[PDB]
Every structure is written in structure tokens, then in C-alpha cells.
Homo-oligomer: A and B are copies of this chain.
């Protein structure tokens, strides 16, 4: 946890975060951050190992307005699991189809709301065989994730905000 805070720069910070996520049994992560009052989602600060094709397509298609995890983040400080039922609109249906093709089926997103108005998300995706297995897994590590997201946010904003 405290290693995040000590890491000099983005690159080593990112590596620490990815490894910590890997330890817990997640295969993909995204840490994404925007400053206060900003809605420039396509130029957010992004770290992690999401597929670059997904990231580019997402930004090009403006999926930040479509991704149900992102609207949720703008509205809440509580985690959102990537349950089928968060994908409610036709476009979110297609979003899910496309996210699945990129390996992003099971996971959750922890909203980030930093001390200086930063808005963001920390998503963790797990490769699982079914929704029963995935959810039960995420539920096991959730208290750890909960502390992790705020440490990530404070240190991560700290390399971004300054």
C-alpha cells in the first residue's frame, strides 16, 4: 500500500499497481483520472493494461458517455460490479458485446473522488468461467480493494496533481 506512495513516477507506480492487482488475482486493470470539473474523458490520465485497441476504440467512440461504470462514478463513491444488468441501454448492450470481445467480461469499478475534485475510476477485471465464480471472488477481496482504491487515488493523484 505505502509502496504506491513512495514510487517516484508514473511508470514504476503503474507497475506496482498492476503487480498488486495481479497478486490479488486480477488480469486487467485501469486507473483513470480527470481533474475537477473536467469532462475530457478522452484525455484522462490512464494507467493499466487494458487492450490498447479497446482503449482507442473507447475514446474514439466516446464510450465514456456510454460506459455505465463511468456515469455511476460521476454519481457515487460505491463500487459497481460488471453485472449484465448494469448494461441497460441498447448502446450499453453493444458496449458489453464489444468489451467482451476485448476480454473485459467480469470485474468491478471503484469510483474515485479525490481531495481536490479529481474524478476517476479504478477498475479490476478477472478472468472467470462464470458470474457465480467471479462475483464470489471479487466479494472475497473487496475490503482489500476498498482500501487499495483510496491509496491508489491519493498517490496516483499525487503524481498527476503534482
Q: Say yes or no: is A150 at the interface (Cβ < 8 Å to chain B).
A: yes
Q: Does A22 contact B (CB under 8 A)?
A: no
Centre residue among A115, A151, A154 by max chain B CB count within 10 A: A115
B115 touches A151 (CB 8 A): no
- Interface contact B114-A77, CB-CB below 8 Å: yes
Contact of A117 among B117, B146, B150 (CB under 8 A): B117
A81-123 with Cβ < 8 A to chain B: 111, 113-117
Q: Does A76 contact B (CB under 8 A)?
A: yes
Interface residues on A, range: 20 to 34
Across the two chains, which residue of chain B brings its CB closest to A155?
B78
Can you name 28 A-B residue pairings with CB atoms under 8 Å? A36-B117, A73-B115, A75-B115, A75-B116, A76-B115, A76-B154, A77-B113, A77-B114, A77-B115, A77-B150, A77-B153, A77-B154, A78-B150, A78-B151, A78-B154, A111-B115, A113-B113, A113-B114, A113-B115, A117-B117, A142-B147, A143-B143, A143-B144, A143-B146, A143-B147, A146-B146, A146-B147, A146-B150
> Which A residues have a C-beta under 8 Å from some C-beta of B?
36, 73-78, 111, 113-117, 142-144, 146-147, 150-151, 153-154
The 10 closest A-B pairs by CB, nearest first: A143-B143, A113-B113, A77-B150, A146-B147, A146-B146, A75-B115, A78-B154, A77-B154, A76-B115, A77-B153
